[PDB]
Amino acid sequence: KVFERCELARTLKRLGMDGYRGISLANWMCLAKWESGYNTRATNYNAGDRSTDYGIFQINSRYWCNDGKTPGAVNACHLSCSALLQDNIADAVACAKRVVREPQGIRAWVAWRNRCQNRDVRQYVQGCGV
Numbered sequence: 001k002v003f004e005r006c007e008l009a010r011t012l013k014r015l016g017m018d019g020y021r022g023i024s025l026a027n028w029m030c031l032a033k034w035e036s037g038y039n040t041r042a043t044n045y046n047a048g049d050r051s052t053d054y055g056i057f058q059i060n061s062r063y064w065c066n067d068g069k070t071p072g073a074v075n076a077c078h079l080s081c082s083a084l085l086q087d088n089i090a091d092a093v094a095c096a097k098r099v100v101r102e103p104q105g106i107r108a109w110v111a112w113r114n115r116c117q118n119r120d121v122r123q124y125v126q127g128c129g130v
């Protein structure tokens with residue numbers, strides 16, 4: 001499913017993402033935009049390490065979810081990676097929250113580092129009423 005920008009912003013606000021561990025909604029929106037284009041079914045396979053990034057937040061099957069085909073998998077979110085391909089993003093959100101409780105926080109996503117960090121991202125939430 002492809003969220004429209006503001007539709008996603010409000011959805012993330014409802015799911016307690018605004019200010020979760022210091023991260024503003026704009027920062028999460030920026031992350032989602034660049035990782036998946038707001039698409040819940042996006043998947044990017046890394047043939048080098050045999051892992052796949054799943055969903056709207058493009059979370060990794062090596063560390064976070066179990067897809068049963070990734071070596072070294074630890075499933076720290078205790079979720080099936082299929083849960084990250086669902087239209088309902090509560091799942092993907094609970095896991096992204098787990099992910100950000102690591103030493104590096106939101107730096108766990110380098111597209112945030114590349115396209116969001118040290119740039120004004122409030123543009124991602126403008127007009128959404130959040």
Ligand SMILES: *[C@@H]1O[C@H](CO)[C@@H](O[C@@H]2O[C@H](CO)[C@H](O)[C@H](O)[C@H]2O)[C@H](O)[C@H]1NC(C)=O
Nearest residue numbers: 057058059060063064099102103104108109
């Ligand atoms: C993307 O892959 C990263 C590794 O290349 C990963 O970062 C590692 O995550 C570990 C989680 O147990 C731990 O924090 C390591 O210190 C860290 O290098 C990162 O979490 C992955 N990002 C996503 C969104 O899956």
Ligand SMILES: *[C@@H]1O[C@H](CO)[C@@H](O[C@@H]2O[C@H](CO)[C@H](O)[C@H](O)[C@H]2O)[C@H](O)[C@H]1NC(C)=O
Nearest residue numbers: 053104105106107108109110111112113114
């Ligand atoms: C996704 O973001 C990850 C940031 O955590 C990044 O993994 C990092 O890779 C670094 C260099 O190997 C270092 O080991 C960090 O500890 C590790 O977390 C991963 O490469 C990113 N990948 C893409 C495609 O965005």
